[PDB]
Structures are given as structure tokens and as C-alpha cells.
Write a structure and sequence with these properties.
The structure is cut from a larger assembly and holds chains A (1164 residues), B (72 residues) and C (52 residues).
Chain A: E1 5-6, H1 12-18, E2 88-97, H2 100-103, H3 108-113, H4 117-124, E3 129-131, E4 144-145, H5 147-154, E5 163-164, H6 167-176, H7 179-191, H8 196-214, E6 223-229, E7 237-239, E8 245-247, H9 249-270, H10 274-292, H11 312-316, H12 322-325, E9 335-341, E10 350-354, H13 355-361, H14 363-372, H15 379-388, H16 392-401, E11 406-409, E12 419-427, E13 431-433, H17 439-442, E14 450-454, H18 459-469, H19 490-498, E15 511-512, H20 515-523, E16 533-541, E17 549-557, H21 559-565, H22 583-597, H23 600-620, H24 635-654, H25 660-686, E18 689-691, E19 699-701, H26 706-712, H27 719-725, E20 730-733, E21 739-744, H28 754-774, H29 780-788, E22 794-796, E23 805-807, E24 810-811, E25 816-818, H30 820-824, E26 833-834, E27 841-843, H31 851-860, E28 865-867, E29 879-880, H32 881-884, H33 900-912, H34 927-934, E30 951-954, E31 962-967, E32 976-979, H35 1006-1012, H36 1015-1033, H37 1039-1049, E33 1052-1057, E34 1068-1070, H38 1071-1083, E35 1090-1093, H39 1098-1101, H40 1117-1127, E36 1130-1131, H41 1136-1142, H42 1151-1163
Parallel strand pairs in A: 9-13, 10-12, 15-16, 22-29
Antiparallel strand pairs in A: 1-36, 2-6, 3-4, 3-5, 7-8, 9-14, 11-12, 11-14, 16-17, 18-19, 20-21, 23-28, 24-25, 26-27, 30-31, 31-32, 33-34, 33-35
Helix pairs in contact in A: 7-8, 9-10, 14-15, 14-16, 19-23, 20-21, 22-23, 24-25, 25-27, 29-33, 33-37, 34-36, 35-36, 36-37
Chain B: H1 5-24, H2 45-50, H3 58-70
Chain C: H1 2-15, H2 21-27, H3 34-40
Classes of the chains: A alpha+beta (1164), B mainly alpha (72), C mainly alpha (52).
The complex binds chapso (2 copies), magnesium ion and zinc ion (3 copies).
Chain C binds a DNA duplex (50 and 51 nucleotides) through helix 1.
Organism (chain C): Escherichia coli
Region (Sigma-70 factor domain-3) (chain C): 1-52
Family (chain C): Belongs to the sigma-70 factor family. RpoD/SigA subfamily.
DNA sequence: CACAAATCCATTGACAAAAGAAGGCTAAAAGGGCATATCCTCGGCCTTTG
DNA sequence: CAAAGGCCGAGGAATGCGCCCTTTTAGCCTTCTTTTGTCAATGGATTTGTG
């Protein structure tokens, strides 16, 4: 409908073009009748009627009188939503400089006049006259004169002398200004001003002058003469209860302007002196300022309160502004929340919706059904039916709800799995029943959390929920393709108890005929669930071109192993269930089922796993007692020995043999060591038990202790919490991080006395205070990242580039901490992978390295594959599907369209929430280190590099820094470095060093790494560091996501050789533009311009957006809007955030086709 | 999550990082130095038997502890 | 309104707790409906940006 | 298939009411004139006082 | 020769703030003229009755 937004400076005439009438009186309503006034801010002539199709007084009260203007009040009879649309204007009696173009930092008026800000402010607030074209009389244009000086200069000069003060002075300075002429003089000086500050500011000014020329703006429009008036329904004066009214602050500021403007007209008509009229003009200036942007002058005028009034600039900016939480965060209909419960019988695709929420949300659908089937004559009769909640509204509910997903969403949507479409299953009660295997995605436990359900309304949104967000489509973490459907705690304890043998149970060494017979034997109670039997198992192995050959054999398994084999689908081997099956065993079981069989068998398998886990966990009868905390008997022996050691060390310290802090360290170490012995002793007591037996002799097997079974099945708990339960508690911290050296020699099976329970409170309160505040800013990294990587979208199928990073294993000194197959799975190869025979193309090229190719690669022991990276993609304004990879949220390759930048932001932010919130140093860690990493900050101690290649050489001695020069083997050596002798060198002056090499030691600033070595160098650096943190805590997140964030980082170019192109030299340009520019200029008979690639921290790169509707969201709205106005910018929308704001489809998801067809039209 | 389980993780990390810092400061395995690196004095036998690998006698050690107490 | 405030500020002190509008209309000369509407005249309504 | 009573259709007269349309009257809202001259704190600032 | 004190001024809460009188302006309130909706007559052109 518009396809683009334009912006400019508003002319006085255009401000009257909008207006429907000039507001003159300050009044608002009548105080008695409450009727709008004849010229007040709430008028009826200016801003339209108060009731629909009904003039103010009431002569014309028919909709048949539409559009006619009443005669007694002039109020045209229209709809009173027109009053929410019509502007008015205020005829300022004096020009008043628009505060944005004056008190903004560059001050477009100031840098456009080539005048200092204080000087304009002196002319403006009536300090000093200014020469405005003073003829030939030796007067200086824009030369300030003071009062006395203006008088005496006027002495001997009865001739014009043309000097003025006030806003009229600046208006006559701007109006007289010739913009192209100044561009010409500034080009002629830039010709011959070849010195840095002079020609620098020359060019920096000619840029704005040429821009003011192009944008159509006139320079003097920044001096308001007419002032527009926001319509009444955007600043209402509505009544509250009991004669009470509630207004906007905008009405106060508007009244202040109107009063002072009317008084100024009065003063001028009354011929008042200079002091009074000057002061009235200053007052009108400050009033208009406060109206536009209250607070830039100082101080923010306060209302009938202590707090400032809110203004227009405030009405847009700030989280209470329009952009923040009215342009994105909106309250939505057809929605509602409740308290979630388990509902463990559902399938992965459904959610128990209460009948009452379902009857409220689906109201219009139900009304339509009752009037379609004839059960309700009209919509009123259907309304009464479903209000009584009769007997057929329930059948209609079943029919309407039948295939109609509902979006379930929980409050911290860290990732896109905090929204999933489920099919509603109607239930009694008022709690939403949420599948158990979905809590991991939602981060939802059933101790009182709540969920919001929304209802898709369109067929297209029904198909987006079903096809896209349905819970049985999203089962792999989008950050890393491991399935997100891992069974959690009753399930894994069920599968562990059943799949866990003991030495002599009922029915040992029977040879069952198969899993059916083992189940029939167990359920009749003839055999126990863990009784090692020979069982005949038929497993089907797709060892073929997907042929599924069957093979039967005689395995040795427990009865539960075989009972559970009945649920496993065909393609899976039998060794998958033949072990104990803790937590990781189950996650890997689902994973291999997914890598063999796909998505439908995996969803079925997940449901069957949950069902059998819950069933055999209930049959487990796995309680928790007090006798289950087996305190080891050697605990007080170990504590006596440790107490003796601390007493001995204290005796030596008393004899001056050690210091104080030394002995503190010694005793802290003694207590940590004795705690380790107690924990080890208790776990070796707990983790095994004796039992008899076929032949009759005692035999040790793993313990069936319940606390241990829960810690060891991976179901819940771990040996540390087990240590606190039966072993000793240990040493406790303080909030400072110091360690209280009086340990907790007690456990929780015993008690703590008052002192130890006090001492533990220190660390407890510290941890809770941190977890309470981490919850506050839980999603700041995700938001920072989606600021910069938002507009990045997969827009192309293949770019064809042969660039690609060389993926290899990370060998962290010893072994590998991440193999090549893991780092390379899912990526598209960039070149042919040759066999170790060095003549056999193993994987040819553009081959999505799935698990087959990845196994082929690890098999030949090919350990350096060149893969295509998102950072080396030759695509413009996007990425292709080949340089990206596979999806990792769906097993397949990425689709053309997928908005991978937002996926990358959330895939780095959500997993980051599992990291420490405060940085800790060991290689630091925590989230703050990751944020600083992406901000690309300069480390204070940069290991200096070798900027040029050549023979090393030194120079002058200690001019602060020891000097060095590198001189090429055949080239010039104009680069020398002030190497600090503090920077203790690494290479002697007699070892010729290659370019891009270390000189000093220390942290490498990524800017220098990028400038010395390939972009691949900077990208490998960044991914290796940030993944260092993420592996430090144990969290897995792919490298694709860091790579796309980095490609958003280094997206600016700096031009060295401008070539035959049209780029200025020392200029930074969007690299995606300069690429196409040099490509085109080299297409024709020119040569391209060569640049130096840049790098910006995410908060710096996201501040450079091609649009301005988007950039006014996460930035200062005021600076962005002032700049866009003076630039005459137009936003051709082409973005995600802009199309969200303006209310159309985004170009990312299903909207990609809409935007493609629309671009077809706009190019036709 | 329960809001106390994450608190547990925070407290665990805090205490462990403190414990291991105060452990690394011990440097039990070491070299027999036999003489002070500050005053060259004879580090007495008992102090080298208690702390294998000392570098300061108790006087210079306590001195350094005062300064590193304040800072810098 | 200024006169109403003056007479009330005096009468509450001299009469005890507070002047009921019948008492003001008696002490004043008004007809006790005019006084009630004068009381009902709202005052300086509010900033709709007020916190909740 | 021929002749007189039964009944939808359109004007007349009379006219009750609804709608304005003015004229008059208050009360309400706006405007005008007024003629001795001029609090509490804090702190500089200077007169007086010793 | 300095010190106390008397004096003046530069800055803030607020227990702080018009009254009496003339003159227009709004609006309500009654009174009357006209457009409009209604009840009853009073034939007059199809509908039915008849043989
Ligand atoms: C509690 C936290 C998991 C929370 C999820 C885990 C994950 C990483 C662990 C630290 C690191 O390993 C580095 C260091 C290694 C030393 O050897 C022992 C101490 C350190 C400080 C460890 C303490 C703690 O164990 C950490 C914080
Ligand atoms: C909740 C809010 C506190 C904000 C912090 C306070 C501050 C001002 C209060 C209103 C005003 O008093 C006007 C009015 C007076 C009536 O007599 C009682 C109702 C009204 C609507 C009040 C309701 C409420 O109490 C308000 C909104
Ligand atoms: Mg909860
Ligand atoms: Zn009207
Ligand atoms: Zn590409
Ligand atoms: Zn010593």
C-alpha cells in the first residue's frame, strides 16, 4: 500500500496543509457542561465531533446529515474517530528554533551555519546581535555583536548594517544561505586545503551541505513558525469516577505554549519595551522546547507533582514510549493463561485445554457453528446458548477444536521453543495440562508455573502452527541438533530400574522365547524384572540400500531389557537397551533412532519411552527413606585425623614456624582433603552391596539403594548432593568468596547445630541473591544479538564461492576435546576431500556432510575438511543455503527464506543462560566474558603483531618505547612501531619475520588479527574463544551461530584505493554495497576500489542499520530521527523489525514469497 | 528450576572456586631451595618440612602478607 | 471556591471535626445545592502517565 | 358463459402532535477601577564600640 | 587597633488568595406557526355470488 516510508523537514506551509484549524485559546472543556471549547485544544471545529454523526450543540443529529457542517457551531457531522486523526496548528508569534536541530550534539543548525553552538545560543536567547549580510561595511557575516557594541557600531553607520538577534536572526541566517554555492566554495577549498583538520572538516561539512541539497529540505525550516497540534484523542482529557478527570502531560505543555504565544501577541500589540518582549520570546522558546523535548534545556518542567512532564520525544522514546512496548509488545485477544499441570497420558502433539478457557477463546468459531448448523437462529441466540452453556455448545466445542492448534507460551521465551502449537484436548478443571517431554523446551516445572495459550485465527496461521511450530516438528535443539525430547526424571528412573540386573532374582537363567514371553512371565510374577535370562531377539538392521534385513539370535539380557525391547522400533540395534540405561543412554537412544529412522518413528518412540518409564517407575516402588543415607563408619576416623592435622598446624604456627595466612591456607587444604576422603568413603559404601547367589557365596553387585539409584541413573541428584546428605558438608564460602575455615562436619541425615546452620546461610543467601537478579536480566544477551543479526535471512540457494574455513579438531594440549566429525557435521564442503592416498575424492563438493559422509570422513582419518562458512558467503543482503549448512532444528538442509539471524541470536542467548552470570577466573568464564567477546573490545595488553613482512630490525633506544622497523626482502619499510620494552619481545633483530606474526605476548586484539590475517583468522579466533567459555561450563552450541553473528560483526569496509569508483578514501561503507559497486565498476571498463575490511562490536554494528524505522527502535530515537530528517532518508522497508512495526508480513518466514512477488511488481 | 536449584549451582561454583584458589596457593610439590630469596637467611628445617618448596622465611613471608593484605 | 475554603478552614477548627455541607450552607449564605456543586467541581485532574 | 354484493385504493376534512423558531428573561461569565506604603533566614557589609 | 552588633539585601516556603459594580453572553423557558403523522369518511375498481 505504501512500500516505503519517506521523511523530511516539515515546511510551515505544509504544517498548515495538515492542519484543520488554528488553535488559539488555551481552554480544554467547559468545566460545567464539559463540552469542547471554540478554539481550545479540544475543539469540535478543528478536531471534529464528539459523538458519531452528531454536531456539537445538537442541531444535526442524523447520519443522513453526514458531511454537512453545522451552522450554529460549525462542527461538521462525521464520525468521532476523525478526532483521533486531525491535526491543528498554532501560529507562532515568533520563530522558535526546533530543539532537535539545535541541542542535538552535532547541532544541524550550528554545523550547517558553520557556527559554534554557544554562539547560536547567544543569538537565540537574546544575548548578542549577529551580522546578517551587513553590506560592504567591513561587517563580518555571522560575526556576533554585543548590545553596547551593536549600538556603537550603529553609531557612524546610519546605513542598514543589517544586524539581528533572536530566533529571527538564525532564521535570516539560514534563509539567506546558498547551499550549492557553499558546496562549490568548500570543494574549491578541499582542492587546496591539504591538511588534516582543515580539509577533514571541509569534507565533513560538504557532506552535510550536499545532503541538505539532495533531501529537498530548506535550511530555514528548522526554525518553527507554525507549530502542529496533536489530535485530541491522542492526548485525551477523559473523566474518571466521581467528576474526576485524567489528562495527558501533553495538554499541559500545549497550554503553556498557547498562553505564552497569546501573551506575546498581546505584548507586541501593546508596544511594550525591549526587556519585556525579549523575555516573552525567551519564555515562548523554553515553552516550545519543553513541549517538543522536555529536559534538553534544564530543567524538565514539573506538573502538579515533583516529576517532569512527558513530551513528544518522551511519547516516542523510552520503554514507556511507542517503539518499546506499544510497537512490538502488545496485548492480544483470543488468548488467556492458566496454571499448568502434568497430564502424562497426552501425546507430544496435544495439550489439555480446560473446557472453560476453550469455550472463551473459541467463542466466534462456536457462534458461527451454532448459526451454521441451525442450532441458533441468529448470533444473539447463539450468544445466549453458549452463555447458558447448553448441551450442544459442548458438541460444537468438540467439533470446532478438532484440528485447531493452540500456541502455548511461557514467559521467558529464551528461544523459539517457548512457543509451540499443540492440539487441544478438552479437559475438566481449570489447569492447562502440558506434556512431560516438553518441559525442557519450556523450562517449566509443575510447581505453579503458568502458560499463556493463544489461538491461531487464520487458515494460514493454522497451517503455520501445524506445519511449522507443532510440537512433533520441533524436537531438536536449534542451537545443537541433539533431540530436546530427553526424558527427565521419573522416566529415566523407570528405564534404569527395569534395565538393571541383579545377581540372583526370580527365574535366573531361563531361556525365554522372546520379549512377549518375558513380559508374560514378569507380569504373572514368575520372574523378576532384572533376572539374567537368555532371550531370543529379532532385530532388524537397515544394512543395505535401506532394505531392513532381519536377524534373530539369543542374547543375554535381563527380563526388563527384553520387556523394553518390545517398544523400540525396527532399525535400532539391540545393544541400545542391553545396558543399564541411565540418562545419557536414553538421550543417545532417541538420537540414534533419529539418525536411523527419522521423525515419525522418533516421536512414537519418545511417547512409548515416557509411557513405559512412568509405568515401570510406579511399579518400581522407589521411595526414599532415612536409612537410605548410609553415613560411612570411617567418617569420624577421618575427621579425627583431619582435626589432629589442623591442631598440629596451629601448634606450629603458634611457634612462629608459619605465618597467619600460610596456616590459613594449610588448614583450608586439610579440610578440603578430609572432605574428599569422606565423600569418597561414603560413595564407595553406597555404590555397592552384597547379595547371594546361585551357588551360595556372597557376591558384590551395584547397590539398589534408592538415593544412589536416583543419583546414578542420572534421574536426579549427583554425588555432591549425596555427599551433603550423608557425607560431611565441608567448608562454606562467604559472599566475598573467602572460605570460612570452620567446616560443617555434619550432614543432613545428622543435623547441623545453630552455628553451622548459620554459617551455611552465608553462601545460601549469596547464591539466591544472585539467582534472583540473574532472573531479572535473563534475556539481555539474546536481545543484544538479535539487534545486529535480525535482518539476516537465508535468501539464496547457492552463492558459488569457494572460500571456506578449514574445520579440524580442537586438540586442547593433550587429546581432542571436540573431534572433527562433530565440528563438521551438517556443513557443506567447499572443495574435494581427497583420500589419504591423496588421489581419491572422498566427498566431492557441496555435499551435505550428514552422518554417512561424516562416518566416511572419520573412517579414512581425513582430519581437515574445508567447509563453507556463513562468514565467507558471496551473497548480498543475505546468506545462501549452502554457505549456511543444515538447519539443526530439522534434520534437513536450510530452506530459502529461514531467518537464520534471529535463530543464531537465540541459539547463543538461551544456552548462555546456563552459564555463570558472573565472570570467574581460573581462562575466565561466565556470560559477561561472552558478551565482552562479542563486543570485540580491545584488551589492554595487546600482544603486538608483525604488520609487514621482511627482515626484523630495531631503531632508536627508549623514546618511551623501544623502536622497531620491519623491512621487506625487496620492498619498502615505511612501517615502524613504538614497541614498549615493557612488551618484552619474542624474536631477536636477526630473524626475518613473516607478516602477521607475534612480536610481544599477551591477548591478541581481534582487530589486529583481522587486519593482519584473513577474515577466516578473526572468525576462527572468535568461535574458538567463545566456544572455550561454552565448553568451560559444559554447554554445547554450534559454530554456525557464532559465525553468523560474526558475519554481522565484520560487515563494514574501509576504502584504501578508491579506484575508478565513486567512493571517498577514508570512508567506511557497508561492505555488501562496496562489493557490488566494485564488481559493477569492474564489469564496465573501470577497475574496482580496494578496501580494508573492518570489525565492529555487536552494539556498534547494530547501530549502523540501512533503515531508520528499525534504527529508531533500539537506539536513541531523537538522534536517529533528526539525522533522517536532515538527510531526507526513505525506508524501503526490506526488514524484519520495520515490517513488524508497520504491521505487515516480515520478509523472513512465510512472508518471503509475499515480498518476492511484491518486488516482482515493483520492478515491473 | 525451583529458584533454589540455580541458587545451589551458584553457591557450588562460588565455594569450589574459592577452595581451589586457596589450594593452588599451597604449591606443596617443589624445590629444596634451602635459603631465603629475600634475605638469603637459612629457612629453618621445620619450615621446609611443613611447606616443601618455600621461598621466604617466616619474617619475609609475613611482611609480604601485610602488603598484599592492603594491595599492590 | 476561595471563600468556601476560608469558611471551612475556620469552621472545622471552631466546630470540631469538619463542616458538613449543610453546615457550610448554613454558615455561608448559599442554598446548599450551589455549595454541593462547588464541592463537586473537580480539581487539577491528573497526569495519565501516573504509575499504578 | 351472463348480471349485483364484498372489498382493496386512493382522496378530504379535521386535527393532534412534533418540530422548530423567536422573544424574553435571568444567572453567569467577563471586564474595570481601585491612590499611605510595605515575613523569615542567612549572610555580606559596614557603624559603633571598645 | 578588632568585634559585636545594627543594617540591608538576596532567596525561599507557604497558615498564602479581592471586592464591588457595570455589561455582555448563554441558555432555558414559554408561545406560536408549520410540517407531519393519524382517524374517520366516501366513493370507486377487482373479487365473488349468482344461475
Ligand atoms: C558448578 C559449575 C556447573 C554449573 C552448571 C561448574 C562448571 C565449571 C566448574 C569450574 C571449572 O571447571 C573451572 C575450575 C576447574 C577446577 O579444577 C575446579 C574449580 C573450577 C572453578 C570449576 C568449579 C564448578 O565446578 C564449575 C563452575
Ligand atoms: C493508585 C494511585 C497511586 C499511584 C502511586 C492513586 C493516585 C491518584 C488516585 C486517584 C486520584 O486521587 C483521583 C480520584 C480521587 C477519588 O476520590 C478516588 C478515585 C481517584 C481516581 C483516585 C484512585 C487511585 O487511588 C489513584 C489513581
Ligand atoms: Mg516453577
Ligand atoms: Zn451545531
Ligand atoms: Zn553463499
Ligand atoms: Zn627470609
Amino acid at each position: 500500500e505504501f512500500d516505503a516510508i519517506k521523511i523530511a523537514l516539515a515546511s510551515p506551509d505544509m504544517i498548515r496543509s495538515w492542519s484543520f484549524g488554528e488553535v488559539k485559546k488555551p481552554e480544554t472543556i467547559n468545566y460545567r457542561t464539559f463540552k469542547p471549547e471554540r478554539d481550545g485544544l479540544f475543539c469540535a471545529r478543528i478536531f471534529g465531533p464528539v459523538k458519531d454523526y452528531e454536531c456539537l450543540c445538537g442541531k444535526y443529529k442524523r447520519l443522513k446529515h453526514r458531511g454537512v457542517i453545522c451552522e450554529k457551531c460549525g462542527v461538521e457531522v462525521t464520525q468521532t474517530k476523525v478526532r483521533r486523526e486531525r491535526m491543528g496548528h498554532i501560529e507562532l508569534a515568533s520563530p522558535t528554533a526546533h530543539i532537535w536541530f539545535l541541542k542535538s550534539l552535532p547541532s544541524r543548525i550550528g554545523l550547517l551555519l558553520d557556527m559554534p553552538l554557544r554562539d547560536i545560543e547567544r543569538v537565540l536567547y537574546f544575548e548578542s546581535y549577529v551580522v546578517i549580510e551587513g553590506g560592504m561595511t567591513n561587517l563580518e557575516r555571522q560575526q556576533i555583536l554585543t548590545e553596547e557594541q551593536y549600538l556603537d557600531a550603529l553609531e557612524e553607520f546610519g546605513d542598514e548594517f543589517d544586524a539581528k538577534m533572536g530566533a529571527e536572526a538564525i532564521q535570516a541566517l539560514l534563509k539567506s544561505m546558498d547551499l550549492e554555492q557553499e558546496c562549490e566554495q568548500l570543494r574549491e577549498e578541499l582542492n587546496e586545503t591539504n591538511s588534516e583538520t582543515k580539509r577533514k572538516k571541509l569534507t565533513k561539512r560538504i557532506k552535510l551541505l550536499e545532503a541538505f541539497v539532495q533531501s529537498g529540505n530548506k535550511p530555514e525550516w528548522m526554525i518553527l513558525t507554525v507549530l502542529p497540534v496533536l489530535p485530541p484523542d491522542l492526548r485525551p482529557l477523559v473523566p474518571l469516577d466521581g467528576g474526576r478527570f485524567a489528562t495527558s502531560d501533553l495538554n499541559d505543555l500545549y497550554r503553556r505554549v498557547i498562553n505564552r504565544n497569546n501573551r506575546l501577541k498581546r505584548l507586541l500589540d501593546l508596544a511594550a519595551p525591549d526587556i519585556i518582549v525579549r523575555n516573552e520570546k525567551r519564555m515562548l522558546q523554553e515553552a516550545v522546547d519543553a513541549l517538543l523535548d522536555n529536559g534538553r534545556r534544564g530543567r524538565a518542567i514539573t506538573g502538579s507533582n515533583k516529576r517532569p512532564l512527558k513530551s513528544l520525544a518522551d511519547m516516542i522514546k523510552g520503554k514507556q514510549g511507542r517503539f518499546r512496548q506499544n510497537l512490538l509488545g502488545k496485548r492480544v485477544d483470543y488468548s488467556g493463561r492458566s496454571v499448568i499441570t502434568v497430564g502424562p497420558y497426552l501425546r507430544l502433539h496435544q495439550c489439555g485445554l480446560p473446557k472453560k478457557m476453550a469455550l472463551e477463546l473459541f467463542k466466534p468459531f462456536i457462534y458461527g457453528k451454532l448459526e451454521l448448523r441451525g442450532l441458533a437462529t441468529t448470533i444473539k441466540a447463539a450468544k445466549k446458548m453458549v452463555e447458558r452453556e447448553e448441551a450442544v455448545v459442548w458438541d460444537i466445542l468438540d467439533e470446532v477444536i478438532r484440528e485447531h492448534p493452540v500456541l502455548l507460551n511461557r514467559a521467558p521465551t529464551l528461544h523459539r521453543l517457548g512457543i509451540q502449537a499443540f492440539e487441544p484436548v478438552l479437559i475438566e478443571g481449570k489447569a492447562i495440562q502440558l506434556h512431560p517431554l516438553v518441559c525442557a523446551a519450556y523450562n517449566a516445572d509443575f510447581d505453579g508455573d503458568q502458560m499463556a495459550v493463544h489461538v491461531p485465527l487464520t487458515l494460514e496461521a493454522q497451517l503455520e502452527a501445524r506445519a511449522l511450530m507443532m510440537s512433533t516438528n520441533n524436537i531438536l535443539s536449534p542451537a545443537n541438533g541433539e533431540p530436546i525430547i530427553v526424558p527427565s526424571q521419573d522416566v529415566v528412573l523407570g528405564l534404569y530400574y527395569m534395565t538393571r540386573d541383579c545377581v540372583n532374582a526370580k527365574g535366573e537363567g531361563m531361556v525365554l522365547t522372546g520379549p512377549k514371553e518375558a513380559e508374560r512371565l514378569y507380569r504373572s510374577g514368575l520372574a523378576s524384572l532384572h533376572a539374567r535370562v537368555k532371550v531370543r531377539i529379532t532385530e532388524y538392521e537397515k544394512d543395505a540400500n535401506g532394505e531392513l534385513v532381519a536377524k534373530t539370535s539369543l542374547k543375554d539380557t535381563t527380563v526388563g531389557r527384553a520387556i523394553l525391547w518390545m517398544i523400540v522400533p525396527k532399525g535400532l540395534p539391540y545393544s541400545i537397551v542391553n545396558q543399564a540405561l541411565g540418562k545419557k543412554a536414553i538421550s543417545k537412544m532417541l538420537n540414534t533412532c533419529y539418525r536411523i529412522l527419522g521423525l515419525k518413528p522418533t516421536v512414537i518412540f519418545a511417547d512409548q519411552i515416557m509411557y513405559t518409564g512412568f509405568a515401570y517407575a510406579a511399579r518400581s516402588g522407589a521411595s526414599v527413606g532415612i536409612d537410605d543415607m548410609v553415613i560411612p563408619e570411617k567418617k569420624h576416623e577421618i575427621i579425627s585425623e583431619a582435626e589432629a592435622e589442623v591442631a598440629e598446624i596451629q601448634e606450629q604456627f603458634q611457634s612462629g614456624l608459619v605465618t597467619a595466612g600460610e596456616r590459613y591456607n594449610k588448614v583450608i587444604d586439610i579440610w578440603a582433603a578430609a572432605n574428599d576422603r569422606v565423600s569418597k568413603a561414603m560413595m564407595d559404601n553406597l555404590q555397592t552391596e552384597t547379595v547371594i547367589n546361585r551357588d551360595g557365596q556372597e557376591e558384590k553387585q551395584v547397590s539398589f539403594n534408592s538415593i544412589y539409584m536416583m543419583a546414578d541413573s542420572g534421574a536426579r541428584g549427583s554425588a555432591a548432593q549425596i555427599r551433603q546428605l550423608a557425607g560431611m558438608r565441608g567448608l562454606m564460602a562467604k559472599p566475598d568468596g573467602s572460605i570460612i575455615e570452620t567446616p560443617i562436619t555434619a550432614n543432613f541425615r545428622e543435623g547441623l547445630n545453630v552455628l553451622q546452620y548459620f554459617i551455611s546461610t552465608h553462601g545460601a543467601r549469596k547464591g539466591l541473591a544472585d539467582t534472583a537478579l540473574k532472573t531479572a536480566n535473563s534475556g539481555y544477551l539474546t536481545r543484544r544479538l538479535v539487534d545486529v543479526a535480525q535482518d539476516l535471512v537465508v535468501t539464496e540457494d547457492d552463492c558459488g564461492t569457494h572460500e571456506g574455513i578449514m574445520m579440524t579438531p580442537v586438540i586442547e594440549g593433550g587429546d581432542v576435546k571436540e573431534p572433527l566429525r562433530d565440528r563438521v557435521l551438517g556443513r557443506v564442503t567447499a572443495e574435494d576431500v581427497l583420500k589419504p592416498g591423496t588421489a581419491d575424492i572422498l566427498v566431492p563438493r557441496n555435499t551435505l556432510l550428514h552422518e554417512q559422509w561424516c562416518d566416511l570422513l572419520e573412517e579414512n582419518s581425513v582430519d581437515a575438511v574445508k567447509v563453507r562458512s556463513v562468514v565467507s558467503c558471496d551473497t548480498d543482503f543475505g546468506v545462501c543455503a549452502h554457505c549456511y549448512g543444515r538447519d539443526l532444528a530439522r534434520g534437513h538442509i536450510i530452506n530459502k527464506g529461514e531467518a537464520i539471524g534471529v535463530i543464531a541470536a537465540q541459539s547463543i542467548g538461551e544456552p548462555g543462560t546456563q552459564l555463570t552470570m558472573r565472570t570467574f577466573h581460573i581462562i575466565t568464564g561466565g556470560l559477561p566474558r561472552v558478551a565482552d567477546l562479542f563486543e570485540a573490545r580491545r584488551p589492554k595488553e595487546p600482544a603486538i603483531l608483525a604488520e609487514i613482512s621482511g627482515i626484523v630490525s630495531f631503531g632508536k633506544e627508549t623514546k618511551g618505547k623501544r623502536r622497531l622497523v620491519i623491512t621487506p626482502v625487496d620492498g619498502s619499510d615505511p612501517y615502524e612501531e613504538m614497541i614498549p620494552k615493557w612488551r618484552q619481545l619474542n624474536v631477536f633483530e636477526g630473524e626475518r619475520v613473516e607478516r602477521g606474526d607475534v612480536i610481544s605476548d599477551g591477548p591478541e586484539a581481534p582487530h589486529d588479527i583481522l587486519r593482519l590475517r584473513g577474515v577466516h583468522a578473526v572468525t576462527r579466533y572468535i568461535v574458538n574463544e567463545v566456544q572455550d567459555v561454552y565448553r568451560l561450563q559444559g554447554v554445547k552450541i554450534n559454530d554456525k551461530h557464532i559465525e553468523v553473528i560474526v558475519r554481522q560483526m565484520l560487515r563494514k569496509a574501509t576504502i584504501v584505493n578508491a579506484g575508478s569508483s565513486d567512493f571517498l578514501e577514508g570512508e567506511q561503507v557497508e561492505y555488501s554495497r562496496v562489493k557490488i559497486a566494485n564488481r559493477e565498476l569492474e564489469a564496465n571498463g573501470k577497475v574496482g576500489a580496494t578496501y580494508s575490511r573492518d570489525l565492529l562490536g555487536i552494539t556498534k554494528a547494530s547501530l549502523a542499520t540501512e533503515s531508520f524505522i528499525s534504527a529508531a527502535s533500539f537506539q536513541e530515537t531523537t538522534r536517529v530521527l533528526t539525522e533522517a530528517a536532515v538527510a531526507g532518508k526513505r525506508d524501503e522497508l526490506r526488514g524484519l523489525k520495520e515490517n513488524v512495526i508497520v504491521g505487515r508480513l516480515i520478509p523472513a518466514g512465510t512472508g518471503y514469497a509475499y515480498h518476492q512477488d511484491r518486488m516482482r511488481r515493483r520492478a515491473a | 528450576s525451583d529458584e533454589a536449584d540455580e541458587a545451589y549451582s551458584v553457591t557450588e561454583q562460588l565455594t569450589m572456586t574459592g577452595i581451589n584458589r586457596i589450594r593452588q596457593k599451597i604449591n606443596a610439590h617443589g624445590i629444596p631451595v634451602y635459603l631465603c630469596e629475600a634475605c638469603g637467611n637459612p629457612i629453618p628445617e621445620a619450615r621446609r618440612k611443613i611447606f616443601p618448596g618455600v621461598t621466604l622465611c617466616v619474617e619475609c613471608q609475613a611482611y609480604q602478607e601485610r602488603q598484599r593484605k592492603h594491595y599492590a | 471556591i476561595n471563600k468556601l475554603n476560608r469558611i471551612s478552614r475556620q469552621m472545622l477548627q471552631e466546630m470540631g471535626r469538619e463542616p458538613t455541607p449543610e453546615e457550610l450552607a448554613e454558615r455561608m449564605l448559599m442554598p446548599e445545592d450551589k455549595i454541593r456543586k462547588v464541592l463537586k467541581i473537580a480539581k487539577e485532574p491528573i497526569s495519565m502517565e501516573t504509575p499504578i
